[PDB]
Amino acid sequence: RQIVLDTETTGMNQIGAHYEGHKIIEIGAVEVVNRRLTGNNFHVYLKPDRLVDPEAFGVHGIADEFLLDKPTFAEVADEFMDYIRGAELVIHNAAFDIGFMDYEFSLLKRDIPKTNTFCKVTDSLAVARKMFPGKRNSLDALCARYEIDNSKRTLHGALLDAQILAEVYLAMTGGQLSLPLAMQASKLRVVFATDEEIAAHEARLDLVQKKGGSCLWRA
Amino acid sequence: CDLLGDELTHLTVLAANNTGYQNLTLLISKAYQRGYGAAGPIIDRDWLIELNEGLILLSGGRMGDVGRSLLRGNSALVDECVAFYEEHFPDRYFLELIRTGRPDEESYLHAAVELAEARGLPVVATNDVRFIDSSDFDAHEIRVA
Amino acid sequence: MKFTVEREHLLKPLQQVSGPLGGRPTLPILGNLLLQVADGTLSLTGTDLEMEMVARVALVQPHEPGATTVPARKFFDICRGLPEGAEIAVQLEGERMLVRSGRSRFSLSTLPAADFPNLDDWQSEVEFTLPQATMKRLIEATQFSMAHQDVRYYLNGMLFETEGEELRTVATDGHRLAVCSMPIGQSLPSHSVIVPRKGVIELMRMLDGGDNPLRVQIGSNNIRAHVGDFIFTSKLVDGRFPDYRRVLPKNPDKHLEAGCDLLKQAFARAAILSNEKFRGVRLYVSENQLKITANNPEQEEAEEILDVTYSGAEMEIGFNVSYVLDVLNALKCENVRMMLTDSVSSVQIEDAASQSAAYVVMPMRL
Amino acid sequence: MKFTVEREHLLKPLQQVSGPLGGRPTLPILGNLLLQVADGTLSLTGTDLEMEMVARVALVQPHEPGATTVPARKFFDICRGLPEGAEIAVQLEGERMLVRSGRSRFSLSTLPAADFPNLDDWQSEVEFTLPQATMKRLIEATQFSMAHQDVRYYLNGMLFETEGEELRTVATDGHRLAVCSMPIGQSLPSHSVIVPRKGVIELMRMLDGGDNPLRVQIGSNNIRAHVGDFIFTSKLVDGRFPDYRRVLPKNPDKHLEAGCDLLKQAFARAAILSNEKFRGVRLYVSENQLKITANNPEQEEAEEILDVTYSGAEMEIGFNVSYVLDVLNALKCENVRMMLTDSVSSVQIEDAASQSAAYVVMPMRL
Amino acid sequence: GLVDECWRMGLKILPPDINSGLYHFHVNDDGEIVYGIGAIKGVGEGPIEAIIEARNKGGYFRELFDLCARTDTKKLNRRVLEKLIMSGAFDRLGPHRAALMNSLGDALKAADQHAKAEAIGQLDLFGVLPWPEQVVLDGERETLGLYLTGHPINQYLKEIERYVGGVRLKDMHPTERGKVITAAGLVVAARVMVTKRGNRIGICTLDDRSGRLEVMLFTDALDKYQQLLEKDRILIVSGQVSFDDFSGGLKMTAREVMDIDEAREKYARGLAISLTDRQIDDQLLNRLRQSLEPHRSGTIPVHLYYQRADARARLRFGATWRVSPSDRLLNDLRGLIGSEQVELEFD
Amino acid sequence: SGAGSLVAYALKITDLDPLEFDLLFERFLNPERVSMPDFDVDFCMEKRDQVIEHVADMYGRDAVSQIITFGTMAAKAVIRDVGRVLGHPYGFVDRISKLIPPDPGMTLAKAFEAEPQLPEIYEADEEVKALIDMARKLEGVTRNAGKHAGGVVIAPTKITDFAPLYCDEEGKHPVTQFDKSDVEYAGLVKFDFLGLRTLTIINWALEMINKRRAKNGEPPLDIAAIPLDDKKSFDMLQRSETTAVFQLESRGMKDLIKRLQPDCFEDMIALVALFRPGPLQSGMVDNFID
DNA sequence: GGAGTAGTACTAGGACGAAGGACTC
DNA sequence: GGAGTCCTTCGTCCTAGTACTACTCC
């Protein structure tokens, strides 16, 4: 059973801990079972605990005052945990998202270990990078590649990208498997330089040495 | 050569002196004067009859006349090929032996070394070098491409 | 060189020999025939330079030996064109071949027989004859799984494998695979040879399935096949056929049995609304039911519910529909039994009455 | 909107009317069918702006009128592929057409009827009915002589010329001409009209040459044909047709008849040694005999001698053999009569036993 | 550059002519200079010689067909012939260049039949019984820009459009997808297949003197939007633009399209005409009225500028008819230039 | 500098009286200097076939050879080459290479210092990084047979007595396998292919002028026979109308001539030597004018 | 109704020409 | 240092082959 997530955040820290000083603002996740969209999506908004990043604001429009009445990670901790527990987590740049996820988990102070200890952590970007090595494997790149509309989609923010990543994910994990198949000393002659050849050799080396001031044959 | 029909083989010819130099100069000119295809201008084996003096030749190894005939296992064709060098290049024909880890090289080498002792002819090994360090290989592959 | 033959002795040979002629004979004499007249036998050659086709007609009327090379397609059409019982007279006039029939006269250019390429003699290693019938079923049953153009050029052909009393043929894409095995009635030593696809097409075409037994000889680098007086010989592409025993499903524990025709009709219809590139149909099995469905991005959808004998658990699985239709077309039979593992394994398919042929296609992840 | 009909009533109409519709036209609704339910009737439409084919079928089970337009190819393949005797239940819901039949269930994408180009109404001027069998004769005997893609846009078609109670056809590309005429037994106006190549191909296609009356109404620039509940309508093109009375040979002095199949088999054979591009042959005719000779660059020759009925002087003339082969094939008769004048002039050709048909093809200068 | 130098010097400079032109720019007695044939950009040297050669053996060329018959397609390709018309070499014969462009293909196809007719010796049945470099530049801008009197889009001239081509596009608004309208001065439309759908393929030309562009990965509607896309010798469409990482252009999807004709509606865009002082009267009630009368649509107010000696007054026609937008092209047909102003209604 | 030889002039090798204009032979052949002073006379490329013909009649076609020039792998070429092999269309790669200035000696290191967008796209684009890292490994490497001649060589025997050839698929257009510097150091004298369209122009324009002969019986025009102080000429020059005037087509050069108003032939000889970065930015131009 | 033959459609390869980066003194 | 000679590479058009589907024959 396959679980798709896309997390929109209050920007990142570019230095040190990418999660230090930051918290989660929106959770948009879709459930994908047997490569079909069930519609049992997990879409919540959270407490910012800080200012929304100017970058993040320009991406899909989110203001702090909107996420104030909305619940925190603590109110949907168990809810979201059970929703993804014992399934496939397909992520973009797993180090980033997992880092935020586990960060929030430790903030709850329920001794919560890293998600990779009880779940299969899979980045989809790494798969795309293996398929198309050294190519741009961004969502919009792959979108255009697999012929997809990302412009006439009403969902703005996480759930948009999650849906798109699901279609990309299906496209990559299509179409069709491959067939497991692939799968003494003796003599031998030494030709000693004749006296003629030796003379030519000596004269040729003389020229090298007289003109150049060196002879390694002879160095 | 007439022995392998259409098949082109790879060859090293060294000019040992100025007689050779002039013969090599004329050999190259004659290939261009003949005309050619995408492969570039080519020499006939028999042009080495006239264009002969002062030249020292390498057999070509696995990729040569004799190597390819050996790998087919046409013993008559192999004997015809070497015979040419025994006639026109006495003391001036060396069999190339190569360990670069490529297909069939050890099987060829084993059979070539047996032929070389059976004929009493002289051999030289090279590394057929195209680059400075082993890590340059990938870049040269792309250069060729 | 002179001989005289009756049109009707020439016609079936001529048609059959003209099959291999096609692919762009750059070397112009490939579009021509090799004639050798000796005894009361004119021999024919039809060739693509890798394989060769031989025909004899008996000479009842006067004959004289000699050889030349006439243009094959043109000569075939003239003969096919003449009425039944028309008298064809051959006679070489220096550098022309003259073909007469009563009062009509035609003259052919002549290139020397001596320029026609000769393939090396080789000898037989393992030897067998078999009824035409068995050869017919063998080819027909598997031809659809031939690779089209593969970089793995060894897959562009069919493995014939002998051992004891069992020959089993296999042909594949790297995606799907069809297998057929038939009794040959003689203990045979083990050999493996891959004949190139165009070769197998031609061989297929020479079989009328009739009464003359077919006798085949296989050498080190060639194959030779005699049915009566016609003889086809091809080269083999040499070896490393991957182990088909490895791909076979290892005891598929679930069985699904259904009417071949019904099933095939429903899949043909569902196929119309699947993906361009991936031919994707999605399948649901449930307690005694089969649901076929087909999707495209424009929300067009074919959907079938069917009553299917099946014991086992619910599961869904997709595949390339063209390849499965190809097998249902080759399955000219009453009942099929489909033997599964899961949504992500290849599946093996057989006639519910014979294990003689087995068909296995991989799953697609749609 | 809602209807129910029997696959069997729907299927041949579907085939005949879909036929000419482009898989991918330049205006893609042209690859959809307009479906209209009104009264007790389903109206089907395929068009290309030049022609239109309409089928009507009475609705036997409960129904509800409305309009929409569905993707033609896929829908036809779906209908063709259905099981024997299938009764399908269809209903419009929103922007999808749902098809139920047994446990098959569909929901197909839909384009609006409103977007479909409604062809033009026109006033009928001259009308007539005739046996289906006469029509089929008229068309078969003649249609293969039309041009394909001539710049003189009025030759991409056939002029029908009506005089008294006779209707006449002629079809031509400017290099060969064929005339065929039949008595229709009705006094008509006097009108000539050229209907397009593709229209005539398809009209011939649907001619179930059985009993059925065929009734036609012609306009000034459109044509209408009713056979049963199939209705064909096409626009016409205007063009000033060439005068067949200047093409009909002036005074053919010499007359020559010969048995058709023997004549034809002989032409087919001499054709093999003609230049492949221009199909050029030379005819030598003498007292009671015909000798045709040809040549190619390969230096081959064809010569045929046959006994023919000929009284007149010897004569030398060359043709494109494709042009005569095509008439000999279409003419399904016993004996022919040729009326020539000389080497440089038009010739009339006809069944020795009928007079309905006459052909002139011009000779060649090589 | 060279011509502008000539002109400043006192040098002029006849337009090309098939009949008069040699290889090089030539001096007829009075005409100091007339176009050399080799002067034409796209035409090869072989084709230029071919033209002249044919003209030498035969007389000077009578007609399109006469030209085609004497010189096969092998020498003068279709593309070659297109530029020849655009240069105005044919203007003599085919008064209407638009007419000549259309007549090329048929004559081309015709000629191939003429080649065939020759080769086979074969008999037939009977048959077949003002300025220099200112017109050419004008044509280029129709194909690569034209934007006279601003643009039909007066209410939102370049304000929406932008027409700098790749060079302007690179520095664009950052967003999900830029808002952009492209119009195409050239379109050819082809749709592919594989027996189970297939998204593609659109051909536009994109300005300024940039190149041409695809679209691009869509069309939405499905086939109604595909037809809006069509239109050769015509197109305006609106799309989303981003800088595509993949090259051969940037990416375009068509969210909306409006035609030139629709822009020419000049909604709330409309028509005003400028005419000379001397107009007959009957022109008021006759030709002027008749141009408007058959082409009516899209309530466009008619505004009239009567250039008086004394002053400019505005007389509103508003007789009844609201003009359809196709009228520009028809009006430009003879002797009268119009200007496309902001429609009065909208403001 | 062969115009310094009055003998060249006397022989019609050159076109100028060197004693009239103080032009110096010792720049061209200096007897007090011992190395060959390659006289390198050049001619119009248009008429190569006519000259190959003369020099074959003279020496033998096999004793005559063209001299090859060599293609390396410089900045714009290496970007293009690697980009294509990495599977980009031409558009992608050209949007990078058009940021590299045209400059003769360009290298990747020089490109990075001249253009700040280079560092930027390198760090922001995987494909670009992979590409330039590899272009750096291959910078300046050969690719092909040099294009035609740079000059034509004259041996006393078969050229193959001295150098190897390259020839095309028809064994035509033979070229020496050693390049211009190398081939001459190996002992054979060369003759370069002058690069001008101006003599082709003169030629064709003279044909057209001299046709104005029979139109009014005018003698043919001999460019050598013109007076050297012509006022029409100097009038038009003082009017600055010198675009399309050979050598003097630059906007800057036209600016200079306008301010300078050069009024005698000596001044016209001077113009190319004056029109340079050194003379202008050492005050000498201003001094001269003043 | 199915099989064989013909015609149409799609895809690949080669030729031709206009554009661009480069190496000559 | 400028300009021209240099070819090659990219794009466009034409030709040829191959497959599929329809039409005609058994």
Q: Is the CB of D215 under 7 A from strand H?
A: no
CA of F72 to C1' of H6 (A): 13
CA of C44 to C1' of G5 (A): 26
What distance, in Å, lies between the first and last C-alpha atoms of chain E?
A: 43
Among residues C323, C345, C330, the alpha carbon closest in space to that of C148 is found at: C323
C274 touches chain E (CB under 8 A): yes
- Least CA distance to F124: which residue of chain A? A136
E runs forming strands in chain A: 2-9, 24-33, 36-37, 42-45, 88-91, 120-123
Pick from C272, C276, C295, C320 the residue to mutate for testing the E interface (most E CBs within 10 Å): C276
Note the helical H segments in D207-295.
244-247, 260-270
Pick from C300, C328, C329 the residue to mutate for testing the D interface (most D CBs within 10 Å): C300
Give strand G nucleotides closer than 7 A to any protein Cβ: 9-11, 16-25
* CB-based contact C358:C145 (threshold 8 Å): no
Angle between the N-to-C axes of helices C7-17 and C72-81, in degrees from 0 to 180, rounded to the nearest 10 = 140
Contact E197 C297 (CB under 8 A): yes
Contact C109 D303 (CB under 8 A): no
Secondary-structure class of domain C1-123 per CATH? alpha beta
Chain E contacts to C (CB-CB under 8 A): 194-198, 222
Among residues D289, D279, D337, D294, the alpha carbon closest in space to that of D315 is found at: D289
* CB-based contact D246:D345 (threshold 8 Å): no
* CB-based contact D251:D309 (threshold 8 Å): no
* Separation in Å, CA of A145 to nearest CA in chain F: 14
D81: nearest CB among C74, C78, C268: C268
CA of E79 to C1' of H12 (A): 10
CA angle D135, D141, D145 (to 5 degrees): 120
CA of F250 to C1' of G20 (A): 23
Q: How far is residue F261's CA from residue F243's CA, in Å, rounded to a whole number?
A: 15
DSSP A192: P
Find chain C residues with C-beta within 8 A of D281's C-beta: none
Q: How far is residue E146's CA from residue E161's CA, in Å, rounded to a whole number?
A: 13
What DSSP assignment string belongs to C207-266? Answer: ----SS-EEEEEESSEEEEEETTEEEEEE-B------HHHHS-S---EEEEEEHHHHHHH
Contact B120 A191 (CB under 8 A): no
Phi, psi dihedral angles at D316 (to 5 degrees) = -125, 130
What DSSP assignment string belongs to D329-365? Answer: HH---SEEEEEE--TTS--EEEETTT-SEEEEE--BB
Q: How far is residue F152's CA from residue F141's CA, in Å, rounded to a whole number?
A: 26
Q: Which residues contact D188 (CB under 8 A, 6 or more apart)?
A: D126, D128, D162, D164, D165, D167
D124-247: CATH, from 3.10.150.10, 3.60.15.10, 1.10.3430.10, 3.20.20.10? 3.10.150.10
Secondary-structure class of domain C248-364 per CATH? alpha beta
Annotated binding site of D for DNA: 24, 73, 149, 153-154
* CB-based contact D350:D357 (threshold 8 Å): yes
F70 touches chain E (CB under 8 A): no
Find chain F residues with C-beta within 8 A of A135's C-beta: 126-127
F162: amino acid identity, one letter: F
DSSP B40: B
Give the position of tokens 């250019």: C109
Q: Helix, strand, coil % (nearest 5) of chain B? A: 50, 15, 35
CA of E273 to C1' of G15 (A): 52
Q: Which residues contact C259 (CB under 8 A, 6 or more apart)?
A: C334, C335
What DSSP assignment string belongs to E250-299? Answer: -EEEEEE---HHHHHHTSS--EEEEE-S---STTTTTHHHHHHTTSB-S-
Give the position of tokens 């009104």: D38
Give strand H nucleotides closer than 7 A to any protein Cβ: 1-14, 16-19, 21, 23
Find chain E residues with C-beta within 8 A of F208's C-beta: 24, 27
Q: Is the CB of C24 under 7 A from strand H?
A: yes
Which residues of A participate in catalysis according to the annotation? 156
- Cis (ω within 30 of 0) for the bond into E277? no
- Cis (ω within 30 of 0) for the bond into F52? no
Q: How far is residue E273's CA from residue E339's CA, in Å, rounded to a whole number?
A: 6
Contact C297 E222 (CB under 8 A): no
Pick from D21, D27, D319 the residue to mutate for testing the E interface (most E CBs within 10 Å): D27
Alpha carbon separation from A94 to A56, A102, A158 (Å, rounded): 19, 12, 16
* CB-based contact B15:B23 (threshold 8 Å): yes
Question: Which nucleotide does the CA of F272 lie closest to, via C1'?
Answer: H2
* CB-based contact C249:C339 (threshold 8 Å): yes
F91 touches chain E (CB under 8 A): yes
Note the helical H segments in chain D.
7-18, 72-81, 132-140, 197-206, 244-247, 260-270, 321-330
Q: How far is residue D294's CA from residue D298's CA, in Å, rounded to a whole number?
A: 12
Where does chain C hold its CATH 3.10.150.10 domain(s)?
A: 1-123, 124-247, 248-364
- Least CA distance to E192: which residue of chain C? C276
Residue F279 CA to its chain's centroid (Å): 23
What distance, in Å, lies between the first and last C-alpha atoms of chain D?
A: 67
Among residues B75, B73, B74, B85, the alpha carbon closest in space to that of B120 is found at: B85
Method: cryo-EM
Q: How far is residue C15's CA from residue C72's CA, in Å, rounded to a whole number?
A: 10
Q: What is the interface size between C and D, counted as CB pairs within 8 Å?
A: 75
Find chain E residues with C-beta within 8 A of F46's C-beta: none
Q: Which residue minimizes Cα–C1' distance to H1?
A: F276
Chains adjacent to C (≥3 CB pairs closer than 8 angstroms): A, D, E
* CB-based contact D166:D248 (threshold 8 Å): no
The alpha carbon dihedral of F4, F9, F14, F16 has a sign of positive
Q: How far is residue D43's CA from residue F197's CA, in Å, rounded to a whole number?
A: 74
- Furthest-apart CA atoms within chain C: distance in Å: 81
* CB-based contact D312:D333 (threshold 8 Å): no
Q: Give me E12's structure tokens.
A: 């002029």
Give the position of tokens 């000999």: D328
Q: Give me E207's structure tokens.
A: 């300005």
Among residues D363, D269, D268, D256, the alpha carbon closest in space to that of D310 is found at: D256
Question: Which nucleotide does the CA of E195 lie closest to, via C1'?
Answer: H20
CA of E42 to C1' of H12 (A): 13
Q: Which residue minimizes Cα–C1' distance to H4?
A: F195
Q: Name the resolution in angstroms.
A: 8.0
Q: Is the CB of F221 under 7 A from strand H?
A: no
Q: Which residues contact C187 (CB under 8 A, 6 or more apart)?
A: C164, C165
What DSSP assignment string belongs to D296-316? Answer: -TT--EEEEEEE-EEES--EE
In this structure, the dihedral spanned by the alpha carbons of residues D4, D9, D13 and D19, taken in order and rounded to 10 degrees, is 90
D304 touches chain C (CB under 8 A): yes
Q: Which residues contact A59 (CB under 8 A, 6 or more apart)?
A: A8
Pick from E23, E33, E247 the residue to mutate for testing the F interface (most F CBs within 10 Å): E247
What DSSP assignment string belongs to C271-309? Answer: HTTS-TTT-EEEEEEETTEEEEEEE-TT--EEEEEEE-E
Q: How far is residue E115's CA from residue D278's CA, in Å, rounded to a whole number?
A: 13
- Least CA distance to B17: which residue of chain A? A200
* CB-based contact C192:C159 (threshold 8 Å): yes
Find chain B residues with C-beta within 8 A of A189's C-beta: 120-123
Element (H, E) at F116: none
Cα R_g (chain F), whole angstroms: 25
Find chain C residues with C-beta within 8 A of D305's C-beta: 103-105
Q: Is A12 helix (H, G, I), strand (E, B) or coil?
A: coil
How many C-beta atoms surround the C-beta of residue F67 within 10 A?
27
* Separation in Å, CA of F134 to nearest CA in chain A: 13
Residue A69 CA to its chain's centroid (Å): 34
* CB-based contact C216:C226 (threshold 8 Å): yes
Find chain B residues with C-beta within 8 A of A193's C-beta: none
DSSP D22: -
Angle between the N-to-C axes of helices B105-119 and B75-88, in degrees from 0 to 180, rounded to the nearest 10 = 50
CA of F262 to C1' of G11 (A): 67
Q: Do chains F and C touch (3 or more CB pairs under 8 A)?
A: no
Contact E251 A152 (CB under 8 A): no
